[PDB]
Amino acid sequence: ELRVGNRYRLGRKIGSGSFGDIYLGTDIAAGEEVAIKLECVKTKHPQLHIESKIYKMMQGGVGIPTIRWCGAEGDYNVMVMELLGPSLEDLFNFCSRKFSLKTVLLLADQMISRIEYIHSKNFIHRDVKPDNFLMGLGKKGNLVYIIDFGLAKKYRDARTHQHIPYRENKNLTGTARYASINTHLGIEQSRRDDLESLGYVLMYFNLGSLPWQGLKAATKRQKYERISEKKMSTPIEVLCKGYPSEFATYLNFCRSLRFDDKPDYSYLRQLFRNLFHRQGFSYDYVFDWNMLK
Amino acid sequence: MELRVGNRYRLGRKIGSGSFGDIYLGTDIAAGEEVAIKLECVKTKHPQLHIESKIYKMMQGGVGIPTIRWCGAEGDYNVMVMELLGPSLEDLFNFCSRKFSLKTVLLLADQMISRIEYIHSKNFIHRDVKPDNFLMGLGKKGNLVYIIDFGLAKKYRDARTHQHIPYRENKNLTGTARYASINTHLGIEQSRRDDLESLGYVLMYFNLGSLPWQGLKAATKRQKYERISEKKMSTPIEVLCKGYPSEFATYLNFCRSLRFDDKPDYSYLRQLFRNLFHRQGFSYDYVFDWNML
Numbered sequence: 001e002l003r004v005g006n007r008y009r010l011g012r013k014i015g016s017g018s019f020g021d022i023y024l025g026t027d028i029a030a031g032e033e034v035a036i037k038l039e040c041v042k043t044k045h046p047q048l049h050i051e052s053k054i055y056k057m058m059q060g061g062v063g064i065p066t067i068r069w070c071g072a073e074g075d076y077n078v079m080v081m082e083l084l085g086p087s088l089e090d091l092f093n094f095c096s097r098k099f100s101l102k103t104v105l106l107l108a109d110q111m112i113s114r115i116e117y118i119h120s121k122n123f124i125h126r127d128v129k130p131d132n133f134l135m136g137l138g139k140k141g142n143l144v145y146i147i148d149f150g151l152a153k154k155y156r157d158a159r160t161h162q163h164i165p166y167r168e169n170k171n172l173t174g175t176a177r178y179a180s181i182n183t184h185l186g187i188e189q190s191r192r193d194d195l196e197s198l199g200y201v202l203m204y205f206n207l208g209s210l211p212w213q214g215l216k217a218a219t220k221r222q223k224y225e226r227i228s229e230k231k232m233s234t235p236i237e238v239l240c241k242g243y244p245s246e247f248a249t250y251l252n253f254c255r256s257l258r259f260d261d262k263p264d265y266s267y268l269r270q271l272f273r274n275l276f277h278r279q280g281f282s283y284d285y286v287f288d289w290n291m292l293k
Numbered sequence: 294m295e296l297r298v299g300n301r302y303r304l305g306r307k308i309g310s311g312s313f314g315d316i317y318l319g320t321d322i323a324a325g326e327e328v329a330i331k332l333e334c335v336k337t338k339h340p341q342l343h344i345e346s347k348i349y350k351m352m353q354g355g356v357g358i359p360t361i362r363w364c365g366a367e368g369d370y371n372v373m374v375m376e377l378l379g380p381s382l383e384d385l386f387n388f389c390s391r392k393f394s395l396k397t398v399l400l401l402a403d404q405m406i407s408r409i410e411y412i413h414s415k416n417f418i419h420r421d422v423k424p425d426n427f428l429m430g431l432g433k434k435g436n437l438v439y440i441i442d443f444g445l446a447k448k449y450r451d452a453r454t455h456q457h458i459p460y461r462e463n464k465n466l467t468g469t470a471r472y473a474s475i476n477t478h479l480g481i482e483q484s485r486r487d488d489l490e491s492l493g494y495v496l497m498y499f500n501l502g503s504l505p506w507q508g509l510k511a512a513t514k515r516q517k518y519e520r521i522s523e524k525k526m527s528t529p530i531e532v533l534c535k536g537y538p539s540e541f542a543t544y545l546n547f548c549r550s551l552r553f554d555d556k557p558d559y560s561y562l563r564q565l566f567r568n569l570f571h572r573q574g575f576s577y578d579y580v581f582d583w584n585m586l
């Protein structure tokens with residue numbers, strides 16, 4: 001129970017984000033439902049205001065949620081954001097945990113572009129997973145958004161574009177299921193890692209699971225190591241057996257990138273667009289969830 | 294002449310037999326409220342209603358836990374007044390001709406795992422997991438599964454330090470044989486794993502209509518329990534669960550594999566069934582079989 005900024009009513013908690021939990025809220029005068037991220041104001045490692053500045057800078061990008069307000073109330077720093085629709089994990093569930101090839105390809109085009117946009121503004125996301133992509137609402141119902149800059153990092157200097165240096169012995173940031181192999185091996189993340197993670201997300205939608213899910217281990221730290229080991233020991237063409245070759249081509253391209261390379265985002269989009277064309281699918285933007293009755 | 298305990302509580306019919314005392318429908322005349330009332334004979338050699346009331350009190354505020362009020366002795370009974378709930382899952386199973394649909398089983402499973410997890414989070418094991426001890430709410434709480442009856446419950450870890458109780462052997466079987474874990478039949482101290490194994494048998498009971506170790510007749514309770522034990526031990530999980538989704542066997546195997554002092558992965562177990570629920574095309578609408586009769 002809180003009122004933020006003389007303007008917003010705080011509603012229920014709906015999930016967690018990076019360094020802050022996510023709540024529904026209401027702009028009381030406008031009657032507009034919003035999403036609200038909260039950070040304990042006494043935290044040793046404050047970052048919500050850093051995140052807010054990244055959002056302000058990213059504003060105007062297609063599929064970046066709008067930031068409505070950032071401030072403080074009571075015991076919290078507060079960031080009020082545009083309300084979006086369900087996540088891609090939610091929609092995957094609503095689609096019986098199967099997506100058509102067409103839907104996978106429609107999603108892939110947008111997800112690559114969203115990652116490219118973030119990179120163009122000098123950041124890497126570092127938390128690419130199905131729960132961080134949400135569909136828009138209303139006139140934006142066909143648009144895939146990416147959320148959460150709480151794990152984002154600047155990878156190149158804004159004035160000179162000098163890339164960050166190569167580093168080793170680093171910690172994993174996001175969900176281990178989708179981490180790149182180099183992230184598991186302790187290498188500093190860069191643009192290639194966001195795109196490799198996306199490749200695992202796409203094959204997760206194709207398969208329903210990844211082969212490194214559900215592994216036994218004594219501890220969380222050891223579980224991550226076993227996930228790493230299974231990823232390293234599963235050839236891409238085994239992972240992607242029976243699916244269009246483009247999914248393997250995509251993953252091998254990402255794994256081939258140098259630390260500081262600029263990815264060829266166009267190439268990666270074109271793989272999937274050419275497959276979409278060869279398959280004869282309609283250019284109607286109809287996703288699988290648009291068929292639900 | 295109608296029964297009234299103290300001046301305040303009018304007893305109606307018996308609605309269940311609890312582990313150490315029976316539960317009656319009743320009226321709190323002073324409050325003007327329909328309630329449930331548990332009575333324990335004050336001359337019992339092993340008084341425990343007050344103990345049970347304390348466990349309920351400590352559980353208070355948990356989702357799906359009834360509220361209670363301890364009322365001490367009245368004449369030659371100890372009295373505990375309880376929030377009145379709706380029908381038990383056994384009662385509903387009978388109403389539904391002793392078979393539930395897969396969707397209903399999976400709706401129930403999600404909540405039952407969560408109720409057990411909650412009890413474990415408050416440092417107790419239930420030790421009598423059975424359909425008679427899960428009740429639906431009344432009215433607007435009709436979609437909520439509650440758990441009742443702490444008469445056999447035991448603290449399994451220290452509330453502060455989480456030190457677990459020690460392993461013990463040669464324990465008598467005091468709960469319900471039909472749903473007892475294999476280790477319980479073998480005299481082993483119960484722990485969190487046993488509550489979850491029992492729940493696995495409850496789910497397969499709802500799927501099948503009966504378990505293969507029901508109806509085994511014998512002269513004595515020890516002989517009957519031995520026949521049940523032997524049938525459980527000698528029926529492979531994959532035979533028990535033949536013709537049902539693999540998740541039911543995966544669940545039971547997971548529970549049987551846990552160490553005595555292991556913390557179960559309750560999230561994994563809920564996700565196992567939620568993924569199945571979605572693959573089957575069901576919606577979380579809380580429309581149970583008894584709603585569509």
Ligand SMILES: Fc1ccc2[nH]c(CNc3nc(N4CCOCC4)nc4c3ncn4-c3ccc4ccccc4c3)nc2c1F
Pocket residue numbers: 014015016017018022024035037065081082083084085086087134147148149150
């Ligand atoms: F009870 C529930 C359960 C799930 C629901 N999903 C939705 C769909 N809307 C949004 N959901 C989320 N969730 C993130 C945390 O896990 C839950 C989903 N973030 C949003 C949303 N709309 C905007 N954001 C949003 C916008 C900007 C962000 C910026 C940083 C971090 C998180 C951010 C989140 N409503 C739900 C609901 F009512």
Ligand code: NA
Pocket residue numbers: 126127128178179180183189193194195196197
């Ligand atoms: Na990544």
Ligand code: NA
Pocket residue numbers: 435436578579580581584
């Ligand atoms: Na219902």
